[PDB]
Design a protein around this nucleic acid. Structure first.
Ligand SMILES: [Mg+2]
Ligand SMILES: [Mg+2]
Ligand SMILES: [Mg+2]
Ligand SMILES: [Mg+2]
Ligand SMILES: [Mg+2]
Ligand SMILES: [Mg+2]
Ligand SMILES: [Mg+2]
Ligand SMILES: [Mg+2]
Ligand SMILES: [Mg+2]
Ligand SMILES: [Mg+2]
Ligand SMILES: [Mg+2]
Ligand SMILES: [Mg+2]
Ligand SMILES: [Mg+2]
Ligand SMILES: [Mg+2]
Ligand SMILES: [Mg+2]
Ligand SMILES: [Mg+2]
Ligand SMILES: [Mg+2]
Ligand SMILES: [Mg+2]
Ligand SMILES: [Mg+2]
Ligand SMILES: [Mg+2]
Ligand SMILES: [Mg+2]
Ligand SMILES: [Mg+2]
Ligand SMILES: [Mg+2]
Ligand SMILES: [Mg+2]
Ligand SMILES: [Mg+2]
Ligand SMILES: [Mg+2]
Ligand SMILES: [Mg+2]
Ligand SMILES: [Mg+2]
Ligand SMILES: [Mg+2]
Ligand SMILES: [Mg+2]
Ligand SMILES: [Mg+2]
Ligand SMILES: [Mg+2]
Ligand SMILES: [Mg+2]
Ligand SMILES: [Mg+2]
Ligand SMILES: [Mg+2]
Ligand SMILES: [Mg+2]
Ligand SMILES: [Mg+2]
Ligand SMILES: [Mg+2]
Ligand SMILES: [Mg+2]
Ligand SMILES: [Mg+2]
Ligand SMILES: [Mg+2]
Ligand SMILES: [Mg+2]
Ligand SMILES: [Mg+2]
Ligand SMILES: [Mg+2]
Ligand SMILES: [Mg+2]
Ligand SMILES: [Mg+2]
Ligand SMILES: [Mg+2]
Ligand SMILES: [Mg+2]
Ligand SMILES: [Mg+2]
Ligand SMILES: [Zn+2]
Lengths: 142, 224, 127, 83, 115, 211, 100, 100
RNA sequence: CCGCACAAGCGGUGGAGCAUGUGGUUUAAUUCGAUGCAACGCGAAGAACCUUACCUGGUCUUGACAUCCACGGAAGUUUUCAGAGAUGAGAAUGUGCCUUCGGGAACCGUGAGACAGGUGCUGCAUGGCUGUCGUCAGCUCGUGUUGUGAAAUGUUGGGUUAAGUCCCGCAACGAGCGCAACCCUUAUCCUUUGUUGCCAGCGGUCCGGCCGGGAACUCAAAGGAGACUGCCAGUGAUAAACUGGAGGAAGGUGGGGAUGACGUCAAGUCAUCAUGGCCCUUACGACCAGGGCUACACACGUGCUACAAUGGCGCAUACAAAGAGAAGCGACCUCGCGAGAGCAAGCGGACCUCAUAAAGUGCGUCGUAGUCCGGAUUGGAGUCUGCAACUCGACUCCAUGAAGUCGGAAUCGCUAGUAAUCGUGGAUCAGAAUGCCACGGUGAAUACGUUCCCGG
RNA sequence: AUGU
RNA sequence: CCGGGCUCAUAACCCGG
């Protein structure tokens, strides 16, 4: 807003576990308020990943995230009065949001026979740090 | 009141002007410590003369308005005035206080109206916020108008702490032709005062001496 | 002995009765798990007992009507919180700090003239 | 369309005109304005001048058209191509 | 596998399969399967030849593809020849049951073409 | 910048209605039509009597009419001679027994409608509008000592180009709802056409509801 | 035994409350037995209409009519009660329905 | 609305009121399930003979005051423009602007 | 310096089909008005006849509609022929009523004029009403004050706000119209009254608040309470104000609504109505049937459903709000594959009916396909409203299965219970909602900041 | 660039 | 060349064919 700035809306923690990151994930996945569908898909993918690799569901998910978190951005701001594509730091909150959005985007493109499967394979690629999720980060860096 | 009392009270103090300025000359005894100094030998007579005229005013019993805008003196002028039951201004002198008194009258009317509402207690009719709002408005009106709300018209004579700080009131007094009794020092034209009091217009001790003498003069004159 | 509380959320309202017991709960003459197919609501309604760790010491009888499943869950939680504070007011502190005591007031916004929705304005046509 | 419980529909005056004509064997074209009247088998072989908003159009009844409405055989609009 | 008429149903669930026959919608398909007394979800494949024979018998009770096409053609020809308004519209390739011709008639008129 | 109707807003806050009969759907439209005809008639007859308003009720299958005028004598006639005729004819058109009551306007200056009617009357007699406006306005204060506004609009003085002009004195707080704004309009015909007139008359503040 | 049930409708809440006050006061002084005045849910009708005479779509306003309801029940209809409550008159704005 | 239109409407309502019972009776015959075919045929044939304006369908509501053929409300027998002015006058009992 | 102005986010429009408006073209006619924002699902909250103002043809001339005079008869009812109808012609019929006993009121017919009649022209002759800047923060007066005057000050300055809101300063002091407040609605509690609403504790029960009973609870609707920077800390010129904290259902205009200052656009409406004035009176008035307003190489605006596995299909099974109803809404039961039909209880409606919410959830199935996607188009066969569904209605069953696989330059909306998505009700209305006005269910992302724009 |  | 976009608009300038 031109006048001021305002804080970011607080979001509840998931009841199953309590990792607010997971709540933000289901939100960024949810479409047309079908929250239950989104959380179902998320749990299914998380299980089918964590019990085929890694030790723990939450920890595997988090590490997978960390492997894709970016650090720099290039989106232009008219700092010098013109649309300079100046590269500046990225907030850790914004880094998390960008990573999450990128990974969810990837799965929609992956095209396996189920969104749970697409999501699980994308997140496994992220945990393996070989996938388009890290690619978007490093292209931003480039 | 005598010369050494005035000296002890700081009535002889003054105001350095850069280099030399002829405006501040009228009562200069000289200068010391880079401060121009007033002649107290002249302080006594004119000061007493102003008091004498004020006493005559007191014998007449004509009202004396005591207005202070010089911040330090405001509470002292209020005290001195209320000691004699006289009117006072202890804030910024609102321009046109005499030339536009026609307007001032309405505020006195409305002040008394809201005060009557307070006595009635009928603010309790209003929604809670509006009751508090009217009380606050009445408080502001009391703050500003309390010193003149009983005056009923243009004052007969004016007491002024400092021509160097009350110059708008002096302007209006000259316009209407109202006698001014005031402290005059260097850096000030004396002609703005009908009965000049030579003496420093700043020092709080000097102000105290002036106000004590003036209030005593008012009460003694009205009691002859 | 018995304690009571009333809860509300959107268009839903709930009556809550609580008594010492092993911890069974019936809402509208059905079990909790039967009532809600979704499993989130089951936590949502139980959070206060979890918070004060009272799960197995109080028995609950519930009635609810109006609004949807989410709103009903929220109303039940609010009523449970109030009933708990009726049982033991010292719990009020942590209950408030958890955000359970506050009555959420958000409600739907009416439609308005010329607007397709609560705030949705029709397409401008570029002109 | 018209219910079957209702039965078909026809305007009375047309019915009498056609009945009288067929008894007489007059077989001259019949002026009429009843586009909404239905066709019955007996009218085969006749000729009806059917008003089309502007003019009464000649029409030669035949058994195929039985069950149709008269207005169905008299266009009311005109067209020949925009170009 | 073939049913009456030159049509090979593919090897999916039977109902979906049979619908292939021109003139057999979902309803007729269910009716045929019920008459033959065969579970609807069996594959076309794996049925005995006797079962396919009884199915060939079933479909005979309806107007078959090659005759259904001819029937429809004859009906439209009759209307066309009669000269009725509805028939006249058919020969002009225009909507025939009262839809606006100022706009939204592509499916009948075809793709647009400039003046 | 069109304004709302001052009376409409304050209905049920400080202003009561002009018709207070209960009805159901079947009765409703025809009741309204009957009332409309009743007023449209009484206004036609009582033009010279300086009538301001008519309030109608339908208690117990009977119509009761109360009329406000600045001089009852013109409408009451000698020994009630003609008001009886009004009663008869209103009973006829209403289709029910009728009852009449008279209330006496006491300050015709402080009635919006009477002021507007006077202004229109003077206009029809080629009076110069500014004079009429000023005299009315000044009268209002002389008697009521509270705010008033007036507007006029049309081909003033037969001017080729129509225009509008107005005059205000005192407080007229429209946006305020506590304000007892009396408002009305009236009509004037001329050789040149129509010249409208609207009037507002503030009369003080209501605290404690209409009750 | 008998019982009187009275339903009241109006557009002014204060007025209908006064009407119920008359009913209950008379029934009390005549020595009847009474169920208190029971409020019932009030219907409100709403109508939105286009303000402009010419074409100004999306410009308009809306009005409402609220009809209130009160109910009173009498379970000791002494005869001296029965007629007396038909001797009463109510303001034009109030509609009264009585039944046994 | 031209005077002729109101004349037409009043004539329609009156004439339609005249033949109400006869049309209802013939309708009862025409729709009867068990009625003889010939009787139904005759009943249908005769209905054509009545005046076309006898049918209630041909009527159109119009504003009582002005007779406008659009923007009608059955509740008031008036069109939108008229109702608003009257409401503003406050002549309609209990009506008020709606803000809920 | 401010605003979903840009930015950061989410979803669309622009390609497809269809609904709807407009331009153009066509026609006997496609009636009229509204064309940057601020015209185009607009007047019209609903054109088969009617409506209807247009076209063709058929008819009337003091008239369809009103007063005034004469004259003749109660009225009215029933029925026959001709004609598409308007009308024309006849039959029986009525044959009455107040009558001061004269007649009159009633109505109905003819004649005579004075007059009727107009959706005919002028919104640049006007009233009334409305849009627009814009819920933008401004617009002015009095007294005083300065300049020889034309005028200025107030209303600028330093802060601070949603704001000419507030404080300080200040040749100004005030006032008025705007701002805010007073009004409705929502969030918590208290009091009052408890049926047709309520069922915690009691008794009985076929287990149905079913009934005895209860007055607690929910709820109903009247009246009260409650939030003010009130409290604390910091900050600030001790100013105002800002930041944080406590308590509370609620915290800093708690949320939404109504409410539109002086004026701008000779903006819109002579077709709601009113009216100056010009124009037509066997016709620019009036009556009737059929036609048109729905046409169709094209262009444009606004919508609706789609191109799919967060999905399609089958089975089972949960949870709403707000409205409407007397020629009305219409259960139950019977009949039909179905739209429906028959019979017929109840309710002027907390009681009865409309009317079982859909998303959701449990099971199965489909396997990425022009498909178990999508449904347009066309054939056949029916129901219902209406005198009457050819032009030109809505709806059901069978069969048929277009285009379409995320859409260029470009462009719109939106800051929280919002966006997106899923259903329910109402008005207009015999019948005819993808439009319009309301109601609830589920329920997000993003805001670095003011540099660009756009506007003020 | 122009524009009643 | 024909159509769509940009503008209160016409030109210049973009996107199809
Ligand atoms: Mg719209
Ligand atoms: Mg058909
Ligand atoms: Mg307005
Ligand atoms: Mg109701
Ligand atoms: Mg109709
Ligand atoms: Mg953006
Ligand atoms: Mg296109
Ligand atoms: Mg398109
Ligand atoms: Mg047009
Ligand atoms: Mg005949
Ligand atoms: Mg004649
Ligand atoms: Mg005339
Ligand atoms: Mg104009
Ligand atoms: Mg113009
Ligand atoms: Mg504002
Ligand atoms: Mg400003
Ligand atoms: Mg100025
Ligand atoms: Mg200004
Ligand atoms: Mg400033
Ligand atoms: Mg102000
Ligand atoms: Mg100032
Ligand atoms: Mg029991
Ligand atoms: Mg109680
Ligand atoms: Mg209350
Ligand atoms: Mg507050
Ligand atoms: Mg402090
Ligand atoms: Mg400090
Ligand atoms: Mg707190
Ligand atoms: Mg706080
Ligand atoms: Mg509020
Ligand atoms: Mg306001
Ligand atoms: Mg125009
Ligand atoms: Mg016109
Ligand atoms: Mg016609
Ligand atoms: Mg049209
Ligand atoms: Mg859509
Ligand atoms: Mg399907
Ligand atoms: Mg229900
Ligand atoms: Mg039922
Ligand atoms: Mg059955
Ligand atoms: Mg329904
Ligand atoms: Mg399902
Ligand atoms: Mg099919
Ligand atoms: Mg294709
Ligand atoms: Mg794109
Ligand atoms: Mg919808
Ligand atoms: Mg309806
Ligand atoms: Mg309908
Ligand atoms: Mg919604
Ligand atoms: Zn000094």
């Amino acid at each position: 807003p031109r006048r001021r700035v305002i804080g970011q809306r607080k979001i509840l923690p998931d009841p199953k576990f309590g990792s607010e990151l997971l709540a933000k994930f289901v939100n960024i996945l949810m479409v047309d308020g079908k929250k239950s569908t989104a959380e179902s898909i998320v749990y299914s993918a998380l299980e089918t990943l964590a019990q085929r690799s890694g030790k723990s569901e939450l920890e595997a998910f988090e590490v997978a995230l960390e492997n894709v978190r970016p650090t720099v951005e290039v989106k232009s701001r008219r700092v010098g009065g013109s649309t300079y594509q100046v590269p500046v730091e990225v907030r850790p909150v914004r880094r998390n949001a960008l990573a999450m959005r990128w990974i969810v985007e990837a799965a929609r493109k992956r095209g396996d026979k189920s969104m749970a499967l697409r999501l699980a394979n994308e997140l496994s690629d992220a945990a393996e740090n070989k996938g388009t999720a890290v690619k978007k980060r490093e292209d931003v860096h480039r | 009141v005598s010369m050494r009392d005035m000296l002890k009270a700081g009535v002889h103090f003054g105001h350095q002007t850069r280099y030399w300025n002829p405006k501040m000359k009228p009562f200069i005894f000289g200068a010391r410590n880079k401060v121009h100094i007033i002649n107290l030998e002249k302080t006594v007579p004119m000061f007493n003369e102003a008091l004498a005229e004020l006493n005559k005013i007191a014998s007449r019993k004509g009202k004396i308005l005591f207005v202070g805008t010089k911040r330090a003196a405001s509470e002292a002028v209020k005290d001195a005035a209320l000691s004699c039951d006289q009117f006072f201004v202890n804030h910024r002198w609102l321009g046109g206080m005499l030339t536009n008194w026609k307007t001032v009258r309405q505020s006195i009317k409305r002040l008394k109206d809201l005060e009557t509402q307070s006595q009635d207690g009928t603010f309790d009719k209003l929604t809670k916020k509006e009751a508090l709002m009217r009380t606050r408005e009445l408080e502001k009106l009391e703050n500003s108008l309390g010193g003149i709300k009983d005056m009923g018209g243009l004052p007969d004579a004016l007491f002024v702490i400092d021509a160097d700080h009350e110059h708008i009131a002096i302007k209006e007094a000259n316009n209407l032709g109202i006698p001014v009794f005031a402290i005059v020092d260097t850096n000030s034209d004396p002609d703005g005062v009908d009965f000049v009091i030579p003496g420093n217009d700043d020092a709080i001790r000097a102000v105290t001496l002036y106000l004590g003498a003036v209030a005593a003069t008012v009460r003694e004159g009205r009691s002859q | 002995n018995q304690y009571y509380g009333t809860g509300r959320r959107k268009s839903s309202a709930a009556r809550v009765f609580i008594k010492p017991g092993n911890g069974k709960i019936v809402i509208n003459q059905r079990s909790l798990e039967q009532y809600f197919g979704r499993e989130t609501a089951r936590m949502v309604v139980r959070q206060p007992l979890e918070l004060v760790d009272m799960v197995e010491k109080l028995d609950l009888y519930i009635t609810v009507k109006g609004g949807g499943i989410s709103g009903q869950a929220g109303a039940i939680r609010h009523g449970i919180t109030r009933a708990l504070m009726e049982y033991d007011e010292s719990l009020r502190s942590e209950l408030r700090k958890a955000g359970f005591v506050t009555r959420d007031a958000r409600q739907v916004e009416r439609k308005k003239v010329g607007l397709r929705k609560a705030r949705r304005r029709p397409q401008f046509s570029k002109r | 369309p018209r219910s079957l419980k209702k039965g078909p529909f026809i305007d009375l005056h047309l019915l009498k005109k056609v009945e009288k004509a067929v008894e007489s064997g007059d077989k001259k074209p019949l002026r009429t304005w009843s586009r909404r009247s239905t066709i019955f088998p007996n009218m085969i072989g006749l000729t009806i001048a059917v008003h089309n908003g502007r003019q009464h159009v000649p029409v030669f009844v035949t058994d195929e058209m039985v069950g149709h409405k008269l207005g169905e055989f008299a266009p009311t609009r005109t067209y020949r191509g925009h170009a | 596998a073939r049913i009456a008429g030159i049509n090979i149903p593919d090897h999916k669930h039977a109902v979906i399969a049979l619908t292939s026959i021109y003139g057999v919608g979902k309803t007729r398909s269910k009716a045929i399967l019920a008459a033959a007394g065969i579970a609807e979800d069996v594959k076309i494949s794996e049925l005995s030849e006797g079962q396919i024979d009884t199915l060939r018998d079933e479909v005979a009770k309806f107007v078959v593809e090659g005759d259904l096409r001819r029937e429809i053609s004859m009906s439209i020809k009759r209307l066309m020849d009669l000269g009725c308004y509805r028939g006249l519209r058919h020969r002009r390739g225009l909507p025939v049951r009262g839809q606006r011709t100022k706009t939204n008639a592509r499916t009948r008129k075809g793709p647009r073409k400039p003046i | 910048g069109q304004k709302v109707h001052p009376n409409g807003i304050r209905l049920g806050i400080v202003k009561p209605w002009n018709s207070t009969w209960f009805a159901n759907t079947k009765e409703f439209a025809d009741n309204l039509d009957s009332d409309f005809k009743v007023r449209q008639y009484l206004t036609k007859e009582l033009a010279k009597a300086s009538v301001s308003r008519i309030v109608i009720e339908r208690p117990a299958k009977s119509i009761r009419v109360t009329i406000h005028t600045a001089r009852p004598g013109i409408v009451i006639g000698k020994k009630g001679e003609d008001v009886e005729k009004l009663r008869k004819v209103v009973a006829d058109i209403a289709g029910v027994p009728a009852q009449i009551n008279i209330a006496e306007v006491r300050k015709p200056e402080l009635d919006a409608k009477l002021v507007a009617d006077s202004i229109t009357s003077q206009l029809e007699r080629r009076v110069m509008f500014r004079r009429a406006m000023k005299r009315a306005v000044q009268n209002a204060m002389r008697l009521g000592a509270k705010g008033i506004k007036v507007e006029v609009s049309g081909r003033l003085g037969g001017a080729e180009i129509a225009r509008t002009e107005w005059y205000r004195e005192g407080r007229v707080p429209l946006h305020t709802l506590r304000a007892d704004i009396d408002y009305n309009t009236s009509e004037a015909h001329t050789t040149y056409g129509v010249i409208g007139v609207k009037v507002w008359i503030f009369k003080g503040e209501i605290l404690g509801g209409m009750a | 035994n008998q019982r009187i049930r009275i339903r009241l409708k109006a557009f002014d809440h204060r007025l209908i409350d006064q009407a119920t006050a008359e009913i209950v006061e008379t029934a009390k002084r005549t020595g009847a037995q009474v169920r208190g005045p029971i409020p019932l849910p009030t219907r409100k009708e709403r109508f939105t209409v286009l303000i402009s005479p010419h074409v100004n779509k999306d410009a308009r306003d809306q009005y409402e009519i609220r009809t209130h309801l009160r109910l009173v029940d009498i379970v000791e209809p002494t005869e001296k009660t029965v007629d007396a409550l038909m001797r009463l008159d109510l303001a034009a704005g109030v509609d009264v329905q009585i039944s046994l | 609305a031209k005077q002729s239109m109101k004349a037409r409407e009043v004539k329609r309502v009156a004439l339609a009121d005249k033949y109400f019972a006869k049309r209802a009776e013939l309708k009862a015959i025409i729709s009867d399930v068990n009625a003889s075919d010939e009787d139904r045929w005759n009943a249908v044939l005769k209905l054509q003979t009545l005046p076309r304006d006898s049918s209630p369908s041909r009527q159109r509501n119009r504003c009582r005051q002005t007779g406008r053929p659009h923007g009608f409300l059955r509740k008031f027998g008036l069109s939108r423009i008229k109702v608003r002015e009257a409401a503003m006058r406050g002549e309609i009992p209990g009506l008020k602007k709606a803000s809920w």
